[PDB]
Amino acid sequence: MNIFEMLRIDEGLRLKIYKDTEGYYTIGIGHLLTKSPDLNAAKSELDKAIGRNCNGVITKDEAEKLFNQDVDAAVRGILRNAKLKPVYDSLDAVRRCAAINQVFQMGETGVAGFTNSLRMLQQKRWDEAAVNLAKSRWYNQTPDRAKRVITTFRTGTWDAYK
Numbered sequence: 680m681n682i683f684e685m686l687r688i689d690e691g692l693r694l695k696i697y698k699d700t701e702g703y704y705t706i707g708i709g710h711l712l713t714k715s716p717d718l719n720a721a722k723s724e725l726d727k728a729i730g731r732n733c734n735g736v737i738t739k740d741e742a743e744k745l746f747n748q749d750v751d752a753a754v755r756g757i758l759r760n761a762k763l764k765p766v767y768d769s770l771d772a773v774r775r776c777a778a779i780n781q782v783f784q785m786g787e788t789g790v791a792g793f794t795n796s797l798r799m800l801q802q803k804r805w806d807e808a809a810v811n812l813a814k815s816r817w818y819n820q821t822p823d824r825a826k827r828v829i830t831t832f833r834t835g836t837w838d839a840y841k
């Protein structure tokens with residue numbers, strides 16, 4: 680188990696434009712296209728991302744290419760974020776995957792909301808951090824995925840992904 684296998688489980692793989700858990704046009708392995716309700720706007724974003732006229736459909740290879748880019752960008756974003764970097768660097772390799780997973784799903788706009796969770800993680804107060812992480816819109820809207828990610832943060836094992 681590694682970050683790619685973990686996110687592949689959590690995000691799935693679909694080769695046609697679909698709506699994510701929030702109702703947003705998405706493709707591949709959780710590649711968000713746009714928050715616009717206009718399918719044509721999503722199709723434009725897709726064509727730009729792939730570099731050809733896709734008409735809303737991609738190949739598995741193309742999905743995996745976007746996924747490589749998205750994971751890379753998620754990790755690098757963490758390192759470029761003054762709040763996230765020290766916490767990330769304090770973590771072991773398995774808990775780092777939980778961090779990448781959460782950033783991949785949520786982006787960085789809500790980082791400040793997780794200030795207390797982040798502190799508890801840096802302090803290695805794992806059970807306390809897990810309790811705090813669940814007190815969130817994130818947990819309530821995607822509880823089974825959040826439970827897996829939280830178990831990963833709590834234990835530093837892959838038990839939730841088997």
Ligand SMILES: CC(=O)OCc1ccccc1
Nearest residue numbers: 763766767778781790793
């Ligand atoms: C806001 C958040 O919890 O993103 C995940 C994370 C967790 C620990 C270190 C870096 C990023």
